Design a protein around this ligand. Structure first.
Ligand SMILES: CNC(=O)CCNC(=O)[C@H](O)C(C)(C)COP(=O)(O)OP(=O)(O)OC[C@H]1O[C@@H](n2cnc3c(N)ncnc32)[C@H](O)[C@@H]1OP(=O)(O)O
Length: 446
């Protein structure tokens, strides 16, 4: 069995290219007697999964690279099964414990990628060189006192987080020995290089606004930190209520996700007034799953994502109502618009052997921007992997190097709790944490 699956055209984008997406699921473990079965069940699952869908055990490999041709990458064979690393941290005094996690409310700092992940997010350190293999997925099982942390790394050219969730979802089935449906098997096997229909005779249009690096425009792929903040279900509904009451006339409704995204942009912009003038431009870059606009199954495991861009000034965003800000976000989510824009980006990339200038954050200034990726809608809270431990107690992204203005929403807890990971420069983070309008809704976790 061999395969040579060309990445999604969108997955040829440089910045998605060299990165691994990480996610950790924490389960309590009653007795250390349970670990060997945990591991063998997980092993057997990975083998079953690889037998059904061989490419999940592959690697991403570029070819045709030269001066001004940045190449084309393909998923190709690597090893028999995806690699899992098993790490026993029960007796490591620098490791988290289930009780430490519970007491601190599952802070990002307790999910240190160097301790609990099989490879770093960024191409930093040993084994991240261009000739080093890039496995499509990598797993780590970490035994901690009273628990288990399962970490999954997805090669970002091969998958966005919606695609990674679909892969993980089927891994959970395989661990249970539950059969895959025909639609799942079809979705996992759709050809990627044709999944976004190209535009005819396309050169450059507004579709790729904010996505091509230009020498006179700041942006592209100071002391700062990461922290989780939690938003209770009631905080979430109160933010949505506040937004709904203050919508633009053009805007019939906004979502829970819109209202939190808007509240973050407003709160960042507000504290930033303490260090820059209100006239400073500010861009919100919001990650959007493009599967629905493209008519693609939610089970498609690839990379089919874009961003929406929202430009204003720090003072306008801080001072306008929450519904005014949420309306800006929702205004860019028309499916026909998402579809045309995504087709345009894919067509531009297709037409250009040198993709080095294309970036989803090409004109985002880290000082004043927000680059937010919501994972709120993914299904990770529901997977038990046949381990007999119940559902995840939490689902958190590992901490890595601060990236100013980069932000995530975690998969939404079933009760509706949101967890936002923010990376900000220290003076912003410090003011935010002390800011009364922020802490009215946001509980700092760290
Ligand atoms: C890298 N990250 C990614 O891949 C990003 C993943 N996320 C996405 O792409 C998401 O679609 C998103 C861009 C983040 C938008 O997230 P949303 O949760 O707003 O989803 P969306 O489907 O646009 O809208 C759903 C909301 O709209 C609401 N809605 C839909 N129709 C109506 C209507 N007729 N009247 C009132 N509300 C409506 C709906 O009730 C949802 O609200 P809520 O209950 O969740 O508050």
């Amino acid at each position: 069995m061999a395969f040579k699956i060309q990445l999604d055209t969108l997955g040829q984008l440089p910045g998605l290219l060299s990165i691994y997406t990480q996610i950790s699921l924490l389960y309590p473990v009653s007795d250390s007697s349970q670990y060997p079965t945990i591991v063998s069940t997980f092993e057997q699952g990975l083998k079953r999964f690889s037998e059904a869908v061989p490419w999940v055990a592959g690697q991403v490999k570029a070819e045709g690279i030269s001066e001004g041709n940045t190449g084309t990458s393909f998923i190709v064979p690597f090893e028999d099964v995806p690699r899992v690393v098993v790490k026993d941290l029960r007796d490591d005094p620098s490791a988290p414990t289930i009780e430490g996690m519970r007491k601190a409310g599952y802070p990002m700092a307790m999910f240190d990628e160097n301790i609990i992940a099989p490879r770093k997010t960024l191409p930093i350190g040993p084994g991240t060189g261009p000739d080093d293999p890039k496995p499509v997925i990598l797993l780590q099982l970490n035994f901690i006192k009273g628990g288990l942390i399962l970490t999954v790394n997805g090669q970002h050219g091969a998958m966005d987080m919606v695609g990674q969730d679909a892969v993980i979802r089927l891994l959970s089935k395989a661990c249970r020995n539950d059969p895959f449906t025909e639609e799942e098997m079809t979705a996992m096997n759709l050809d990627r290089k044709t999944i976004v229909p190209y535009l005819e005779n396309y050169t450059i249009g507004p579709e790729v606004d904010h996505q091509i690096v230009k020498a006179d425009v700041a942006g592209g792929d100071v002391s700062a930190s990461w922290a989780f903040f939690t938003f209770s279900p009631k905080a979430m509904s109160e933010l949505k209520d506040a937004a709904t009451k203050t919508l633009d006339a053009s805007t019939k409704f906004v979502s829970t996700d819109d209202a939190l995204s808007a509240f973050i942009w407003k709160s960042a912009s507000r504290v930033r007034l303490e260090r820059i003038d209100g006239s400073a431009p500010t861009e919100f870059c919001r990650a959007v799953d493009a599967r629905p606009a493209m008519g693609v199954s939610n089970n498609y495991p690839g990379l089919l994502q874009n961003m929406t861009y929202h430009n204003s000034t720090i003072g306008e965003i801080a001072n306008e109502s929450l519904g005014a800000t949420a309306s800006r976000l929702r205004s860019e989510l028309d499916p026909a618009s998402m579809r045309q824009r995504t087709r345009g980006l894919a067509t531009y990339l297709h037409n250009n052997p040198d993709k080095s200038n294309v970036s989803l954050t090409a004109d985002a200034d880290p000082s004043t921007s927000v680059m937010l990726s919501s994972w709120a809608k993914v299904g990770l809270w529901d997977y038990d992997f046949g381990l007999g431990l119940g559902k995840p107690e939490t689902v958190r992204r590992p901490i890595f190097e601060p990236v100013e203005s980069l932000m995530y929403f975690m998969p939404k807890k079933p009760d509706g709790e949101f967890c936002a990971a923010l990376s900000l420069r220290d003076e912003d983070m410090d003011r935010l944490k002390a800011d009364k309008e922020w802490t009215k809704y946001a509980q700092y976790v760290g």
